[PDB]
Amino acid sequence: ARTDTEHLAINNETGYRSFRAGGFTFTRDEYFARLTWPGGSHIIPIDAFLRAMMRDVAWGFFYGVVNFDHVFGTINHYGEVTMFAGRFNDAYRNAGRDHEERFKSSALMAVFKDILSDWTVEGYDPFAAPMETGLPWGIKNGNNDEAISRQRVTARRMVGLPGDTPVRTDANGFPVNRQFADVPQEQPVVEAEPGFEAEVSAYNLFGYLSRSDVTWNPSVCSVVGDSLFCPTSEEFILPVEHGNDRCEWFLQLSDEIVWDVKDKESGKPRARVTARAGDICCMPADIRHQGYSTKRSMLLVWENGSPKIPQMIADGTAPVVPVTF
């Protein structure tokens, strides 16, 4: 599992740095992320690229396969990470033209962070919806390190508990997003008996989500064993096609989303799933998915975080769908 990465030259015309990770090569210009590897090249619009990179960075390579698109992406092996071109593309694979390299995670993570920092310019936030931020086009112009560096937020037990991750307020840096301005903010009435003020806990979760400053970022709010409630606020398009190595459930809390559903292995379209407020559905472990959301909307992503699942799905000792009827 490879470790070799490298900073190359700042280009004199564009002002950006190119980077290397194994056989892979990363170059940006005014419009494009340019990728090469042994035997191949590919291009991705710089805005779509940075948005995807932003997620893969923030999510620590996430669960399973993070497809930037139909060619390029990562597989997470939890401590090691596969970078690929065309691994989940019928055309490359049938032709034996896909290319894969495996890395220690903190070593790929490091060059990814360097790419994201160098390639991001003043006023461009790749964690936000396009209506909320500026543009990535043109030569290197300053940076946006504050935006690409927000601290991941994770509950040990539940938001708001003594010593656990806290509630979001104007005070502490999280005002309500313009597209959730009507969302009620009152906290639930909590009244503990003397001695119990630590165990008697409630919070306004929809108010919490309305105060999320990024889009498409599942973030832990409550924990029961490996069962994790990861709600987030969603706007525009999920900047990746997620092929999970486990089943995952979506509960639409507000407004609506359409999930474009494709085959995980081939990338052939399979179904389109429209979800409104209170709809709950399952994403099978043999699909990849990508959501589209016009108004900023509240989604609950529900995960089982157990390490056991992938090898069981491969072995067939757990199912591709959690129930049948």
């Binding site: 539940m158 929809f206 179904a271 979800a275 209170g278 559905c281």
Partner: protein, 166 residues
């Protein structure tokens, strides 16, 4: 003039799966309000499952019997006002088998222990249900809720009744 659409027992609008090449049963698609609307009060119908873990939908109406659990649970109010009472059990082992999972229906009778406190949930509010407490709900009006938990003696599975199949 921003409107953030939320559902209610009375007013929701189910979506669904459009097929290209797939079986709609794979997405196990339902709507929590619908499921809560048809069930018996406090009946915990599972709407999501992943190995042993579950999400449960239920309608709160009147006063529930008592519950306790060998692990933590969480409850999310989704519509209308729900009151939660907490009692610290003197011997929780007497109501809950320790090696068990999922919530336990521990009876309508007041169990022995002391008063932990009280919670009042509206739409969008989440509460801790801590292991070792017994808990009880009161809703003056039909309200909906979800449980983050594990399948046990209280959880009702009826996938074919509730999910899209065409």
């Amino acid at each position: 003039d921003v409107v953030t659409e939320f559902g209610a027992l009375t007013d929701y609008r189910k979506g669904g799966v459009e097929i290209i090449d797939d079986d709609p049963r794979n997405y196990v698609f339902s709507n929590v309000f619908e499921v809560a609307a048809n069930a018996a009060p406090y009946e915990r119908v599972a709407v999501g499952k992943n190995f042993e873990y579950v999400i449960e939908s239920a309608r709160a109406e009147g006063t529930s019997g008592w519950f306790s659990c060998a692990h933590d649970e969480f409850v999310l109010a989704m519509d209308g006002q729900i009151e939660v009472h907490l009692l610290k059990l003197d011997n929780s082992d007497a109501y809950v088998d320790p090696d068990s999972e999922g919530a336990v229906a521990i009876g309508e009778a007041l169990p022995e222990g002391r008063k932990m406190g009280r919670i009042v949930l509206r739409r969008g509010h989440m509460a801790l249900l801590p292991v070792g407490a017994a808990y009880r709900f009161y809703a003056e009006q039909p309200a909906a809720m979800l449980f983050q938990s594990i399948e046990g003696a209280v959880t009702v599975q009826k996938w074919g009744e509730i999910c899209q199949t065409e």
